[PDB]
């Protein structure tokens, strides 16, 4: 069917510009509907940021002002996203859907990508078996069990940052 | 703008019950209104469309009603699946805010030491499976000396297949705070628990 | 052969018993032939567009892959053909220049216009990317096409300063009933989306609704106007016209309507009754009633509307609202069912009536009395279903007789297409 | 289903006449009908179609007109290759149907007969039957009697009479009579006489 | 061009099946028009048996009563026809005709069409015989066969003018007799060939008789 992917980078620096791309596949934007983007806050809060129409008409929220930007490539069938200052609030996770003109739904949602806003440099994992994981910046580290073969017993904990700014998680199985 | 309360943020209720989630909104929207399903990890989903027509390949569960200002969503046979956050949002003109949300809890108890030491730090983890109520209290004991403002805990959300909740708590002390005891246990009192169970 | 319609009025029949009130006739004849046709499978004729001057006729359509919406455009054809009499009961055509437009991949839509043994076809591009690539629903320019019977066509390029719209416009759609032309200028009708910066107070006017007003709120009503729910872009109407026809070097101008009288864009027609002028708009919301104004002239200030129901459109809408009390709702109806007048008020008039049935749809055709009565006679009872028509009459042997245009499918399982009948009016009193 | 009458089944005209032919139908079916055309040993080609309207390539002679039930079909002026086969086909909704067709053919002037007369053939005798054949090569009308004469005997019930169908080009006809007889029979006889 | 061809079986005993078979060539029976069987029996009386839309949907006339059946087999482009029950009244020729739906409305092209006869005999092949000779006439008299479709030709397709191949009448014996006869100059009797060339390819038997 129609499925949209979100890609870029996960850390920005405050007060800088990120870049977001959100590619289609089975659909043309340029052929019907609009296509948004929504974030969802980590106090499972979520807002709308704007749109961009077919026809090239793009709408924005009036509470992001004009710090936003959203343009289109109709050779790649991708539609870009731009945020001008980016503060520490600005840290969510941002979805990209499309907008069926009736009845009236986002049918189509993206798998969503984290963004965080932080001055610090990013961190490799150091990983220790019992499997726990430590000193990470700025992720939400996947992991894996035996290739995904084992996916029954799967307790994958929250990750908690260390003072030390490090976010370390414990996964474990039965 | 437009603004909607969506109330209660949680509930509980076991398997088999009733249950209603309720969207006010601030002026008529004539009934474009949606509701999503947000399971743990994954992008919300869409449930509802208009208020009263489902969505294809969802549960005959769910059903929509309302009108005019105020809107509820209903869910009846409640399953150990439907552990996730439920959104109202307006989509009757720009800007599209959404709902507070709200947390579904089925009510329904039976709840190593460090590799790392080289690098300088030690890490002790006392792991509690099933533990059932979310409640708990944690009790770190070096040589028999409880500690306090050490400990972190991570707890997972509840378990889609069974109703289980997992949790951890780790103890970070460096290599020869460590190597300084010998003796290590770890309380779990709580709710189920009213013996100190102790795993030193 | 033929003359323009010059309207019946009253010779007899103005004593006392004088319900001088004409009615269609009983028989409706075939014209074979008005346009090439064909018998694959994947194939739609879509949208015609058909007019007729003083003696010639101007007839265009279009052919899609596999869908009738939507779908690649195969081509789209043009005939130049002339009414004529062979010794048959009813009027016949004769075509004598069929004609396919250059790289049909770049048109939005098109429409024609005749006049007096001259043809014209306007049609709007889309932009165009550095490969060539029709950047869908676009608007770059403009292409008119000249006509003459045994005369090679003539084209003209209008960009840039040629054409001067009221609002700045993204999409431009020519409406597919067509325009006239009068004197050296010409009068079609074109919708599409309109960037407003102002506050919308958009045209509410219902039944007697009591759900929360039936969406008489007039958010509702404003909502429909919108794209996507943005205020900030509009689907409006406007007029348009071309300067200097017969100078080699053609302008546009155009006249927007205001979304207070108006509703949602869509396709409509431009008439030429009397002296005075008219325009049809077709149903495209909510709202499926008869929409028709009479003008002075060609001139937003001076339109005055008029305030009949039928055609209650009843087909290819996505509505719930009772034709009794049409509620404000949301949906979108992709119709087409226009009237031809045939008096100088336009209080007589002819039209062609669809209602859907549990399968295919059963139609009739009724001529409206100033006095608010009826004429109707059922017609096509071996057809599936039929969507669309389209009425041209004409004087034809002392007589007014009227072409009917029409799309849909005879048989169930066979592709759409295009079907053409006339049939006479005929004028009598009580 | 719709049930099409058609009359008359044989018309014949000198050449230049015009003839009409009418198709009835049981119930209206509007202007949905078409006039085909079969010349003998040959599929049928459309010549009307509507009721009214002339196919492409179709000479001017041929008109037809009518709607609801009653039609008619027309010549302005018959030449001498349109004997042919005739009938009306309605489309109005299936199953298709035919009317029963008419018959055309020509008059003309009045031509003589040609007679012939064969013997039978040396394998015909070692076969162990007799045959003799007596043809006519070219007259009008149809009409013509002839009988077989062996020794002076009338014979009865021992011969076949095939007439071919109106020559196209001269409008005449060809008869051909044969005799069966056994080989005793025609061994025991010597003089045959065929006379028309 | 668009032409249809039939083929099948030509003598059928009673209350058995009948197979026919139509190949078009040079034009795809799914691409688009309609393909019917249309039979007309002796009197030239027509009749409409059912057809086969593009897209595979099969029409019947209700007066078969549901002892036809149409399919088609797309990989070679045909469409065949299915008759059970046979019986003497189901004696005529069988054409598969196309049908276009779109400006026309009518049955554009035709196939050569075949016979079929209905009987409890048996085939027979011919004996043909020799009718040795400005106004000279040469002909060749082919008796005792069955089924009654026989051709008859002159010179391997020359001396056609002049032919008149008579009609075809059965004997008491059950079998059928023809008599064709082409007139030739007299002059010319003892210089040209005369060899009539006679088929019955329902016996396949070609008989080259000089």
């Given at each position: 069917?129609?499925?949209?992917?979100?890609?870029?980078?996960?850390?920005?620096?405050?007060?800088?510009?990120?870049?977001?791309?959100?590619?289609?596949?089975?659909?043309?934007?340029?052929?019907?509907?609009?296509?948004?983007?929504?974030?969802?806050?980590?106090?499972?809060?979520?807002?709308?940021?704007?749109?961009?129409?077919?026809?090239?008409?793009?709408?924005?929220?009036?509470?992001?002002?004009?710090?936003?930007?959203?343009?289109?490539?109709?050779?790649?069938?991708?539609?870009?996203?731009?945020?001008?200052?980016?503060?520490?609030?600005?840290?969510?996770?941002?979805?990209?859907?499309?907008?069926?003109?009736?009845?009236?739904?986002?049918?189509?949602?993206?798998?969503?990508?984290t963004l965080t806003v932080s001055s610090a440099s990013t961190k490799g994992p150091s990983v220790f078996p019992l499997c726990l994981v430590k000193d990470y910046f700025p992720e939400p580290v996947t992991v894996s069990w035996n290739s995904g073969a084992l996916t029954s017993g799967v307790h994958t904990f929250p990750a908690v940052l260390q003072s030390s700014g490090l976010y370390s998680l414990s996964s474990v199985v039965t | 703008?437009?603004?909607?309360?969506?109330?209660?943020?949680?509930?509980?209720?076991?398997?088999?019950?009733?249950?209603?989630?309720?969207?006010?909104?601030?002026?008529?929207?004539?009934?474009?209104?949606?509701?999503?399903?947000?399971?743990?990890?994954?992008?919300?989903?869409?449930?509802?469309?208009?208020?009263?027509?489902?969505?294809?390949?969802?549960?005959?569960?769910?059903?929509?009603?309302?009108?005019?200002?105020?809107?509820?969503?209903?869910?009846?046979?409640?399953?150990?699946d439907d552990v996730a956050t439920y959104y109202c949002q307006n989509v009757l003109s720009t800007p599209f805010t959404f709902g507070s949300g709200t947390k579904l809890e089925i009510k329904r108890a039976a709840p190593f030491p460090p590799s790392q030491l080289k690098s300088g730090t030690a890490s002790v983890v006392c792991l509690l499976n099933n533990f059932y109520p979310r409640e708990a209290k944690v009790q770190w004991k070096v040589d028999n000396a409880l500690q306090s403002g050490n400990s972190q805990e991570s707890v997972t959300e509840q378990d889609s297949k069974d109703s289980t909740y997992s949790l951890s708590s780790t103890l970070t002390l460096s290599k020869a705070d460590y190597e300084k005891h010998k003796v290590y246990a770890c309380e779990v009192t709580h709710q189920g628990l009213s013996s100190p169970v102790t795993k030193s | 052969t033929i003359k323009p319609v010059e309207y019946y009025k009253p010779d007899g029949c103005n004593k006392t018993n004088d319900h001088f009130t004409m009615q269609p006739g009983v028989n409706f004849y075939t014209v074979p032939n008005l346009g090439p046709s064909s018998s694959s499978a994947d194939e739609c004729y879509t949208n015609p567009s058909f007019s007729i001057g003083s003696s010639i006729y101007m007839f265009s359509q279009e052919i899609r892959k596999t869908d009738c919406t939507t779908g690649e455009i195969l081509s789209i054809?043009?005939?130049?053909?002339?009414?004529?009499?062979?010794?048959?009961?009813?009027?016949?055509?004769?075509?004598?220049?069929?004609?396919?437009?250059?790289?049909?991949?770049?048109?939005?839509?098109?429409?024609?216009?005749?006049?007096?043994?001259?043809?014209?076809?306007?049609?709007?591009?889309?932009?165009?990317?550095?490969?060539?690539?029709?950047?869908?629903?676009?608007?770059?320019?403009?292409?008119?096409?000249?006509?003459?019977?045994?005369?090679?066509?003539?084209?003209?390029?209008?960009?840039?300063?040629?054409?001067?719209?009221?609002?700045?416009?993204?999409?431009?759609?020519?409406?597919?009933?067509?325009?006239?032309?009068?004197?050296?200028?010409?009068?079609?009708?074109?919708?599409?989306?309109?960037?407003?910066?102002?506050?919308?107070?958009?045209?509410?006017?219902?039944?007697?609704?009591?759900?929360?007003?039936?969406?008489?709120?007039?958010?509702?009503?404003?909502?429909?106007?919108?794209?996507?729910?943005?205020?900030?872009?509009?689907?409006?109407?406007?007029?348009?016209?071309?300067?200097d026809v017969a100078s080699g070097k053609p302008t546009i101008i155009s006249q927007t309507f205001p979304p207070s009288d108006s509703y949602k864009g869509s396709n409509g027609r431009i008439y030429t009754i009397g002296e005075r002028y008219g325009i049809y708009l077709a149903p495209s919301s909510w709202n499926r009633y008869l929409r028709f104004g009479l003008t002075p002239d060609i001139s937003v200030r001076s339109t005055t509307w008029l305030k009949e129901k039928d055609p209650i459109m009843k087909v290819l809408t996505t509505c719930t609202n009772t034709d009794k009390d049409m509620c404000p709702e949301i949906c979108n109806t992709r119709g087409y069912q226009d009237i031809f007048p045939l008096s100088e008020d336009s209080s007589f008039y002819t039209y062609i009536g669809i209602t859907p049935s549990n399968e295919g749809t059963k139609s009739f055709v009724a001529v409206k009395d100033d006095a608010g009565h009826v004429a109707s006679i059922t017609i096509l009872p071996n057809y599936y279903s039929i969507t669309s028509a389209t009425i041209s009459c004409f004087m034809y042997k002392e007589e007014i007789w009227c072409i009917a245009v029409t799309e849909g499918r005879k048989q169930k399982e066979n592709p759409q297409r295009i079907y053409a009948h006339s049939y006479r009016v005929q004028k009598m009193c009580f």
């Amino acid at each position: 069917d129609v499925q949209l992917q979100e890609s870029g980078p996960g850390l920005v620096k405050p007060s800088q510009s990120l870049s977001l791309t959100c590619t289609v596949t089975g659909y043309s934007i340029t052929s019907d509907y609009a296509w948004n983007w929504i974030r969802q806050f980590p106090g499972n809060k979520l807002e709308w940021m704007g749109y961009i129409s077919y026809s090239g008409s793009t709408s924005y929220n009036p509470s992001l002002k004009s710090r936003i930007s959203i343009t289109r490539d109709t050779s790649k069938n991708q539609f870009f996203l731009q945020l001008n200052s980016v503060t520490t609030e600005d840290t969510a996770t941002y979805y990209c859907a499309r907008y069926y003109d009736a009845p009236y739904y986002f049918d189509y949602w993206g798998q969503g990508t984290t963004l965080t806003v932080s001055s610090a440099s990013t961190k490799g994992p150091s990983v220790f078996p019992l499997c726990l994981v430590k000193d990470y910046f700025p992720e939400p580290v996947t992991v894996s069990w035996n290739s995904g073969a084992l996916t029954s017993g799967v307790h994958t904990f929250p990750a908690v940052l260390q003072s030390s700014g490090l976010y370390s998680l414990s996964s474990v199985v039965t | 703008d437009i603004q909607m309360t969506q109330s209660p943020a949680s509930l509980s209720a076991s398997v088999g019950e009733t249950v209603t989630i309720t969207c006010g909104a601030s002026e008529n929207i004539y009934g474009a209104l949606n509701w999503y399903q947000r399971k743990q990890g994954k992008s919300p989903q869409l449930l509802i469309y208009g208020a009263t027509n489902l969505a294809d390949g969802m549960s005959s569960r769910f059903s929509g009603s309302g009108s005019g200002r105020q809107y509820s969503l209903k869910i009846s046979s409640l399953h150990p699946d439907d552990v996730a956050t439920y959104y109202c949002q307006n989509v009757l003109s720009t800007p599209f805010t959404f709902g507070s949300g709200t947390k579904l809890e089925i009510k329904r108890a039976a709840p190593f030491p460090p590799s790392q030491l080289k690098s300088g730090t030690a890490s002790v983890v006392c792991l509690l499976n099933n533990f059932y109520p979310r409640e708990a209290k944690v009790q770190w004991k070096v040589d028999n000396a409880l500690q306090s403002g050490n400990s972190q805990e991570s707890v997972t959300e509840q378990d889609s297949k069974d109703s289980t909740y997992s949790l951890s708590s780790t103890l970070t002390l460096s290599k020869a705070d460590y190597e300084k005891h010998k003796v290590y246990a770890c309380e779990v009192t709580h709710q189920g628990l009213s013996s100190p169970v102790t795993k030193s | 052969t033929i003359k323009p319609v010059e309207y019946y009025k009253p010779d007899g029949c103005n004593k006392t018993n004088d319900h001088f009130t004409m009615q269609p006739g009983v028989n409706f004849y075939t014209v074979p032939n008005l346009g090439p046709s064909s018998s694959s499978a994947d194939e739609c004729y879509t949208n015609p567009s058909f007019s007729i001057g003083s003696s010639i006729y101007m007839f265009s359509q279009e052919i899609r892959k596999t869908d009738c919406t939507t779908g690649e455009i195969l081509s789209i054809q043009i005939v130049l053909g002339r009414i004529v009499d062979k010794g048959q009961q009813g009027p016949q055509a004769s075509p004598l220049l069929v004609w396919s437009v250059p790289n049909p991949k770049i048109i939005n839509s098109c429409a024609v216009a005749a006049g007096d043994e001259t043809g014209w076809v306007l049609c709007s591009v889309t932009l165009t990317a550095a490969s060539g690539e029709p950047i869908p629903h676009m608007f770059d320019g403009f292409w008119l096409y000249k006509f003459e019977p045994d005369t090679e066509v003539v084209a003209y390029r209008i960009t840039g300063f040629a054409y001067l719209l009221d609002k700045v416009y993204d999409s431009v759609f020519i409406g597919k009933g067509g325009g006239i032309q009068r004197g050296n200028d010409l009068y079609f009708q074109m919708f599409g989306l309109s960037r407003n910066r102002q506050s919308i107070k958009a045209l509410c006017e219902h039944g007697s609704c009591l759900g929360t007003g039936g969406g008489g709120y007039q958010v509702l009503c404003d909502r429909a106007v919108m794209s996507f729910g943005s205020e900030e872009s509009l689907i409006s109407n406007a007029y348009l016209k071309v300067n200097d026809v017969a100078s080699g070097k053609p302008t546009i101008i155009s006249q927007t309507f205001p979304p207070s009288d108006s509703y949602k864009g869509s396709n409509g027609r431009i008439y030429t009754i009397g002296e005075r002028y008219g325009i049809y708009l077709a149903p495209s919301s909510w709202n499926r009633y008869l929409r028709f104004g009479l003008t002075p002239d060609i001139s937003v200030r001076s339109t005055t509307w008029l305030k009949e129901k039928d055609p209650i459109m009843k087909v290819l809408t996505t509505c719930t609202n009772t034709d009794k009390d049409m509620c404000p709702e949301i949906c979108n109806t992709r119709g087409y069912q226009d009237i031809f007048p045939l008096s100088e008020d336009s209080s007589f008039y002819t039209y062609i009536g669809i209602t859907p049935s549990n399968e295919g749809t059963k139609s009739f055709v009724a001529v409206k009395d100033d006095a608010g009565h009826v004429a109707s006679i059922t017609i096509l009872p071996n057809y599936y279903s039929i969507t669309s028509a389209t009425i041209s009459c004409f004087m034809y042997k002392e007589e007014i007789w009227c072409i009917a245009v029409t799309e849909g499918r005879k048989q169930k399982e066979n592709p759409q297409r295009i079907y053409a009948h006339s049939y006479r009016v005929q004028k009598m009193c009580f």
